[PDB]
Design a protein around this ligand. Structure first.
Ligand SMILES: CN(c1ncnc2nc[nH]c12)C1CCCCC1
Ligand SMILES: [Mg+2]
Ligand SMILES: [Zn+2]
Length: 313
């Protein structure tokens, strides 16, 4: 266990920052992830033979879609790494273990379509799981990979720590269903502003971890403007594929997903930043002050989208 992963100096420095981009080199992404586990968790949390075999099975089971791909998986895992590192003492050894794996696995086997398109398509997954359809599939896919011979990275945990970490991971993945974020955030907003929020309460921890999951999942909006903007093309590339699929079922898609209505994109971003992103990072900063840089960067990118509408860029 005397094998440490190191990064080049620039990555070594920039990886601690929230707005870090993992770069266009796929073959460095697993090392970035292992680097993060070792510093976040310990050089001993996992067996390196098992972890690497787990990481490469997870990579295999992400598809080649414009946005919900292996790059998303590692980007979301880096955001959770930054949160965990700026909030060292607030999380148990197990939560740090669990949440980084949850992040990496949270969009396993994503096809690039919303839960809504599965229902209207009448996809078998919609019949098997009536809500959080893809999120229940992602968790299912994670358990399958953990059960491959040589892949159980949790082996050294007790029976009880094992059940705890799969429960931390299952709640974590379900919480990336953005339909559940609105209620979750409203409740956290309420508990913080009445003073009832209590991190020794497991149901309160669960909601907080869920908000973090949303924050990590939406973290494309917290990067420097050029990363945010170019990630938005990949997001809209999936949205327009889905819109096209909606029209093939004989359903006019909402305008955000209609590729005839690209002109409305900057205004669509305003709504999303105001309705989703800003609220998410406001509440997360109120509960975990050291995550303020996510709010700051999200507000900057809001300002960047406003400048696009005014026609300045
Ligand atoms: C990432 N989410 C976004 N939706 C719309 N505009 C965005 N700009 C950055 N992120 C955006 C969605 C991604 C797919 C699941 C639903 C959330
Ligand atoms: Mg997802
Ligand atoms: Zn995701």
């Amino acid at each position: 266990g005397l094998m440490q992963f190191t990064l080049p100096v620039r990555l070594c420095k920039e990886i601690e920052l929230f707005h870090f981009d993992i770069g266009p080199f796929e073959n460095m992404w697993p090392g970035i992830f292992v680097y993060m586990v070792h510093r976040s968790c310990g050089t001993s949390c996992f067996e390196l033979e098992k972890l690497c075999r787990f990481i490469m099975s997870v990579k295999k089971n992400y598809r080649r879609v414009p946005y919900h791909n292996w790059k998303h998986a590692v980007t979301v895992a880096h955001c959770m790494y930054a949160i965990l590192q700026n909030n060292h003492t607030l999380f148990t050894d197990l939560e740090r273990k669990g949440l980084l794996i949850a992040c990496l696995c949270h969009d396993l086997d994503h096809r690039g379509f919303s839960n809504s398109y599965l229902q209207k398509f009448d996809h078998p997954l919609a019949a098997l799981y009536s809500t959080s359809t893809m999120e229940q599939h992602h968790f299912s896919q994670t358990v399958s990979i953990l059960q491959l011979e040589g892949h159980n990275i949790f082996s050294t945990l007790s029976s009880s720590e094992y059940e705890q970490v799969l429960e931390i991971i299952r709640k974590a993945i379900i919480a990336t269903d953005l339909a559940l974020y609105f209620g979750n955030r409203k409740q956290l907003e309420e508990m913080y502003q009445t003073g009832s929020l209590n991190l020794n309460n497991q149901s309160h921890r669960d909601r907080v971890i869920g908000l973090m999951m949303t924050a990590c999942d939406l973290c494309s909006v917290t990067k420097l403007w050029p990363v945010t903007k170019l990630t938005a093309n990949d997001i809209y590339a999936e949205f327009w594929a889905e819109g096209d699929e909606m029209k093939k079922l004989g359903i006019q898609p909402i305008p955000m997903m209609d590729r005839d209505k690209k002109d409305e994109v900057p205004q669509g971003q305003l709504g999303f930043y105001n309705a989703v992103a800003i609220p998410c990072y406001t509440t997360l900063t109120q509960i975990l002050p050291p995550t303020e840089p996510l709010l700051k960067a999200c507000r900057d990118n809001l300002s960047q989208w406003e400048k696009v509408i005014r026609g300045e860029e």
